[PDB]
Amino acid sequence: IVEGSDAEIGMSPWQVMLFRKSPQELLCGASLISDRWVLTAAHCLLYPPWDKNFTENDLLVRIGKHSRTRYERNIEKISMLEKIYIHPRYNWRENLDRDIALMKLKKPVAFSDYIHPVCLPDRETAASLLQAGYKGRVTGWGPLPSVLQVVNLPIVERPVCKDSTRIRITDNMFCAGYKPDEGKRGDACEGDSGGPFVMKSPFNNRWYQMGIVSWGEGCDRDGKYGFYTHVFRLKKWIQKVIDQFGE
Amino acid sequence: EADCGLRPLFEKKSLEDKTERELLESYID
Ligand SMILES: *[C@@H]1O[C@H](CO)[C@@H](O)[C@H](O)[C@H]1NC(C)=O
Ligand SMILES: [Cl-]
């Protein structure tokens, strides 16, 4: 996160960090969607042109973290993974279409003040809230920044999104970020990849994950926007995996 | 599941975070 502010404790209790187990290394953000399931971007786990193809035993997650440079005893939770599931039509060759992956925890986690799942959108919530100008929130760590950072970013008009890149964009992506001369700045960056873009519903006041940080051009550069996996468009596969596996 | 998206330190205690109003203000314009 660039041009954000420190998160308050417990502000993003669905925030998950993905680590390579050996050797230790922060890879990506992710999100808690139940006691047993974590949502992330497929490119965090699989990207063949770079020979990237992590398996479950390569990885750990850390949940309930507020500070980056410390094991947070009594607050943080570390979990191993049973299985990774990548969208079968994830298009790593062209444009990262359907950049989505689920991770099944080895054991269910206990909820606390600091650990609590985010909601996934239904049709009505997606249609109401996914509109240009409407702001969501992304969380992650700062450049080179020991405390979790937060930034609020408005959803961008689709022709403006398309216009900003040579990449073929699909209905499975949206973009967010401030236009130049809006004054305000802010963006997701690199290590925030895989992390959640959340919105608070005005209908029931619950937080919904609408996006997954997917790709962009650099960091908080004028006229460029971060691109996000459209979680609702992919909910059928999410629900299928969670229903089929997860025993 | 049934209790998703409600933060124990915020919605569950009738407390606002420092910037959530800005999000909701953006929908009601
Ligand atoms: C990823 O790894 C599995 C082996 O666990 C392999 O079968 C699959 O072909 C690999 N995919 C790549 C490198 O694209
Ligand atoms: Cl799908």
Nearest to A118 by CA among A44, A41, A32: A32
Q: Is A213 on the interface with B (CB under 8 A)?
A: no
The reported resolution of this PDB entry, expressed in Å, is 2.1
The boundaries of the domain holding residue B11 are 1-29
Q: Tokens in use for A37?
A: 């399931």
Total domains in chain B come to 1
Q: Do A118 and B4 touch (CB under 8 A)?
A: yes
- Contact (CB, 8 A) for A179 and A155: no
Experimental method: X-ray
- Mutating which of A114, A116, A148 best tests the B interface, going by the most B Cβ atoms within 10 A? A116
Q: Which domains are seen in chain A, by residue range?
A: 1-12+118-232 (2.40.10.10), 13-117+233-246 (2.40.10.10)
- The whole-angstrom separation of Cα A164 and Cα A217 is 9
CATH assignment of the domain containing B1 = 4.10.140.10
Work out whether strand A81-86 and strand A101-105 pair parallel, antiparallel, or are unpaired.
Answer: antiparallel
Sheet order of strands, A196-200 included: A5-6, A149-154, A135-140, A196-200, A207-215, A226-230, A173-176
Residue A53 Cα: closest atom of ligand 1: 1
Residues with CB under 6 A from ligand 1: A 48, 53, 55
**CB-CB neighbors (< 8 A) of B17 in chain A:** 8, 11
Q: In this structure, are residues A211 and A159 in contact, taking their beta carbons and an 8 Å threshold?
A: no
- CB A99 within 8 Å of CB A41: yes
Cα A7 to its chain centre, rounded Å, is: 16
User: Which ligand has an atom closest to residue A42 CA?
Assistant: 1
C-alpha separations of A33 from A21, A121, A202, B2, B16 in Å: 22, 11, 20, 12, 22
